[PDB]
Design a protein around this ligand. Structure first.
Ligand SMILES: OC[C@H]1O[C@H](O[C@H]2O[C@H](CO)[C@@H](O)[C@H](O)[C@H]2O)[C@H](O)[C@@H](O)[C@@H]1O
Ligand SMILES: OC[C@H]1O[C@H](O[C@H]2O[C@H](CO)[C@@H](O)[C@H](O)[C@H]2O)[C@H](O)[C@@H](O)[C@@H]1O
Ligand SMILES: [Fe+3]
Ligand SMILES: [Fe+3]
Lengths: 192, 192
């Protein structure tokens, strides 16, 4: 069966941006529930012996909601880092300049998409088939991982459990936290 | 310009089921925000002079998300009361018996609809064209108000801000608070 990946850092490693408690519920409870829920759904079904990605790329309903959420979340914890934040670097920094003209322009473009992403959703930095960076929003469990020629680069969870303990209703404050945490390294690895 | 309706009871009136804080953020911030956003979008569009209900039955995208959320929320506040909870009464109680056989059947039915309502959503007790009761789920800002022949009776907000402060990730606990607060007098008024 599937297992809950270990967090890539200490539970308080992302303080003061994302709290030890948010990580305890978000990773320890929510992510974990998606994993039990998927395990509880695959016994004696096609998805029996398949990899997570194989499953998301081939299901609908409950199996997809749960599998995608497991993948989307693991992608999310990686998008954050106790040593991330600040100016982008290497190849990603450059492709962001190619696309938006500047990092600041990219930042404002992402924020806009994220604050306005209606309901439980996800906002992604992606690499397109033409090799260019773009920002796309997904709702609930939808993930670009299932889009041909689209390479997820980074993601921001916008379901309210991701920031309500720490920022209540103000997404902009949460996003301020994300930019302090952004894992550019994970970003460049995915990009290249 | 639309306005934030006043809360039907004191901010601590739903304690311990729904805290003073949830109400301050939920009613005082979340709901207020929809009001300001729709008030910001109507000017210069074919909605300027229409009623809230008129807007939500004819709008799209942003104007709809907003107007509907205002309607849904106003309905939601009325579905709770410091003097509600417990067994259904009068007309609604007997209709529940007619459809589900027993109040408990109805209840287990509804809880199951609500608990599995993926992402931001609403679970509704609606009165159908045939005169019977049914439970239906909408996601994000969708509302049965836009379905002809379908009269909305009660609703439970399932967006996470509605319960996270008080219950974190456990919707069933939230639902326990909802059944302690159900406003049967409002349900019966809408049914009659
Ligand atoms: O995994 C169970 C089902 O979850 C989804 O359906 C639920 O959530 C929807 C909103 O996201 C509701 O409208 C619906 O009423 C719920 O049952 C999923 O779409 C279903 O295919 C799953 O079977
Ligand atoms: O009012 C702004 C827009 O809100 C919705 O679209 C946003 O939220 C969607 C998810 O619910 C995202 O997919 C989308 O990218 C966001 O822009 C609404 O559907 C749009 O019509 C509104 O313009
Ligand atoms: Fe999440
Ligand atoms: Fe709400």
């Amino acid at each position: 069966a599937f297992e809950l990946p270990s967090l890539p850092y200490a539970i308080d490693a992302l303080e003061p941006h994302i709290s030890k408690e948010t990580l305890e519920f978000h990773h320890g409870k929510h992510h974990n529930t998606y994993v039990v829920k998927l395990n509880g759904l695959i016994p004696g079904t096609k998805f029996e012996n398949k990899s997570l990605e194989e499953i998301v790329c081939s299901s609908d309903g409950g199996v997809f909601n749960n599998a995608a959420q497991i993948w989307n979340h693991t992608f999310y914890w990686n998008s954050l880092s106790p040593n991330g934040g600040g100016a982008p670097t290497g190849a990603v920094a450059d492709a962001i300049n190619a696309k938006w003209g500047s990092f600041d322009a990219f930042k404002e473009a992402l924020n806009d998409k994220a604050v306005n992403n209606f309901g439980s959703s996800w906002t992604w930095l992606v690499k397109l088939a033409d090799g260019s960076l773009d920002i796309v929003n997904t709702s609930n469990a939808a993930t670009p991982l299932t889009d041909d020629g689209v390479t997820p680069i980074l993601t921001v969870d916008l379901w309210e459990h991701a920031y309500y303990i720490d920022y209540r209703n103000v997404r902009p404050d949460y996003l301020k936290g994300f930019w302090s945490l952004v894992n550019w390294e994970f970003a460049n690895a995915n990009f290249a």
